[PDB]
Every structure is written in C-alpha cells, then in structure tokens.
Ligand binder design. Sequence first.
Ligand SMILES: Nc1ncnc2c1ncn2[C@@H]1O[C@H](C[C@@H](N)CC[C@H](N)C(=O)O)[C@@H](O)[C@H]1O
Ligand SMILES: [Zn+2]
Ligand SMILES: [Zn+2]
Lengths: 120, 295
Amino acid sequence: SSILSLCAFSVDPKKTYLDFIQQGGTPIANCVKMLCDHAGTGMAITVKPDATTSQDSYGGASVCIYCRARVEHPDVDGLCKLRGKFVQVPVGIKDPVSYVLTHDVCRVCGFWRDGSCSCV
Amino acid sequence: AASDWKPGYSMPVLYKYLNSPMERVSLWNYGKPVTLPTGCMMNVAKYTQLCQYLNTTTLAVPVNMRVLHLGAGSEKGVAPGSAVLRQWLPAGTILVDNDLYPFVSDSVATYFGDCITLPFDCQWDLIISDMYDPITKNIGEYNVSKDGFFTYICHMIRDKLALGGSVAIKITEFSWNAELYKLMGYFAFWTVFCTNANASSSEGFLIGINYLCKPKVEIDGNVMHANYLFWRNSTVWNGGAYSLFDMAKFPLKLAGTAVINLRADQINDMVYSLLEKGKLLIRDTNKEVFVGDSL
Ligand SMILES: Nc1ncnc2c1ncn2[C@@H]1O[C@H](C[C@@H](N)CC[C@H](N)C(=O)O)[C@@H](O)[C@H]1O
Ligand SMILES: [Zn+2]
Ligand SMILES: [Zn+2]
C-alpha cells in the first residue's frame, strides 16, 4: 500500500495519514472486524469485544497506524495499546484508523472522550 | 435449510471406518450461495465457526494456556484468524503465531519465517494451522501424501504437545499428510470439521482432542483421507453463516483444567480418564513470559 509506505517513511505517521485523509485519500482497508453479540458496555479499548448495538469491534493491531505501517510506536519503551485488544467504533464508520487517531480514551471510565465518557 | 445454521459439519464416524478409493472431489455447490454478515472477512467467519465447534469438545482450557497458530498471515498483512483466536481464548492465554511473510497480529508474539525455524522450544496446549501452499502440490496422476510443513506439524504433535492438548490442522483435497491422519489415532477423539461458511471448498480442519501419546486406534492415513473425500463427495451442503448471529456463548470458558508436570511413570488409569475429559494437561507448569505480553 502506498499510504502505509509514506507513513513508514515519515517522522509522524499519524500526521501523514490524517493529512492524506483530509486531501481525499482513501482510508486504510482490511481492518479486522469481529463478530460479537453486541451486548457490551461500549468502552473504547477492551480485553475482548465490547460493542453495543451502536458499535463495530475491531482487532486492535489492524486499526493501529503504527502496527500497519511497520514503524515503532510513539513510546519506544512501552507496548502498543491497541495490539492484542479490541477497538469499538461507531457502527457505520468506514475509516476506523482515522477514528482511533483523533479520539482519546478517558483513563478512568474507559469510554471514548466523544460524548460517551461522563466523568468530571 | 436447517443444517445451514450450525457452525459446520464433522465427519460421521461410519466414514472413518471405510476403505474408500482415492478420487477427485466434486462438490455440487461451486456457485458459493452464502452471504457473510455485513463487512465480515471470510476467515473471520471461518475461524469463528471453527471455534464454535471447538466449544463443544472436551478441550483442555487452563490458566496460562499455550496456543500456537501456524500460517496466521494474509496477503493483506493482517491476521484475521489470530484476532478470532484472541477474542475466543480466555484472557491471559499465551497466543503465539507464525507465517512465512511479515504481517501484523494481535498475538503476544509473532515469528516470521518457515515454521520449521520457530525459535520457541516449549510444549503447547493447542496448535492451530491454516498453512496452505496453492498448486505447488505434488505433481503426477495421483493424489499422494504431502510432506511440507506437515512434517513439522507431525513433529510438534509427537514432541511439543502436552498430554491432553489438542490440534486443529487445515487440510484440503490435495493438501494433506498420511502420518498426520495416523497421529489422530493418538487422541481421545478426532474428526474433520468443515465450516458452513466455506462449504464450497474441500477445506477441512483435521482435529485431534486430548492427546494421549499412545495409539488408541490404528489409522491408515492414506485410506483416511480418501474416506474424508468420499464423505465430501456423498453429501451436499448449501453453506451458510447463520451461526455467526449467535455469539452470546462464543468465548471459550476456563474448563476446570489442571497442569501437572507428571512423569512418564505416573500416567496411570485415572490420569488417562482425566486427559480424555479435558481436565488435565501434562507439561512443565511455568508461565512462559514473552516480551510482548501485557503481563
Ligand atoms: N512452512 C510454512 N511456514 C509458515 N507459514 C507457511 C508455510 N507455508 C505456508 N505458510 C503460510 O500459510 C498461509 C496460508 C494463508 N491462506 C493463511 C490465511 C490466514 N490464516 C488468515 O487468517 O487469513 C500463508 O500465509 C503462508 O505464508
Ligand atoms: Zn500498534
Ligand atoms: Zn471517563
């Protein structure tokens, strides 16, 4: 893939991808969407699929720009937060990589900070 | 058809007793009349249906289960089967996978290369293979036993699989091995499972449950594969993915399984009945610690 190779050549894979989306690029494909009972609580990144009927659930590594582009993650001492877990996004979404890159997980309740988190 | 709603089909026992001649497979259903739930990759459906079948067996499922997944990569560089296994297996299960070519996976460790060079020397509780090489098959007029990665699979069963462990090995009409079939005689139970989603394919999963390390039955591998093809030749399935809408019970439950580093001299009558129930795995008990496991 051309965009993944551009991302891997660049200092900031996230910026490179998001700029590319904004410029008309077509989203990363082949994200691994799981089958689940959609009876989950709806948290963002979970040990097992946790989607509500409002969400899709994805294999974490397949929606991680750094994993997909084969470049080191931002924290070289740590481990990818997505790989080995499952990522819940709105059920329609066609660009799950973008969604993951532009939202933040509340660190106490575990939901996305996009109107699902209720803390503070 | 009602049968479209199960995860798939397993070889009827009677076929396992036949002496079928080897013949080409001919399925009645090559038009592939099955739809997949929206946005769903074929191998996600396939692996999910395989795990649905394995949910009905006496799989030994302990804490710190060791699972090896060979042939986990795709041409698109992701690992759909490994994602399903990660969803399926209990939290804290050590899932390690492998493929010839680089790919990105939700396993705790991935090794790129010939499975033969896999650098881990531990004993495993469950080995899944989807390894497959297209049309680089043994040429000739005869469908004969193949020796590729199957040689390695047989070696892992003989030396690197805990007593009580299980395997599920992808085979097709041409991609099969006679010794692997014979080794299924060393398990408490063995079958071939064909997923409903891929019913239009000779693909089957050759499954052994609860390894005993002793031949419980004697299987001529060459005859057995012919028997499997004869079964595919004398049954007609629509195919289907309806079982994928029943996911409430999907996750594999801890089975009530103990791990004991028993000696070969302590494998008595009780041990064996425990092995056949999925209640006991015999191997070293230490937690295998991988660098990439969030511990
Ligand atoms: N000796 C071998 N060692 C390791 N992998 C192999 C070997 N031979 C074939 N393979 C792999 O078997 C795989 C067959 C694939 N169709 C597997 C699809 C994959 N399981 C999925 O979830 O989509 C290829 O990726 C091969 O690289
Ligand atoms: Zn990553
Ligand atoms: Zn919150």
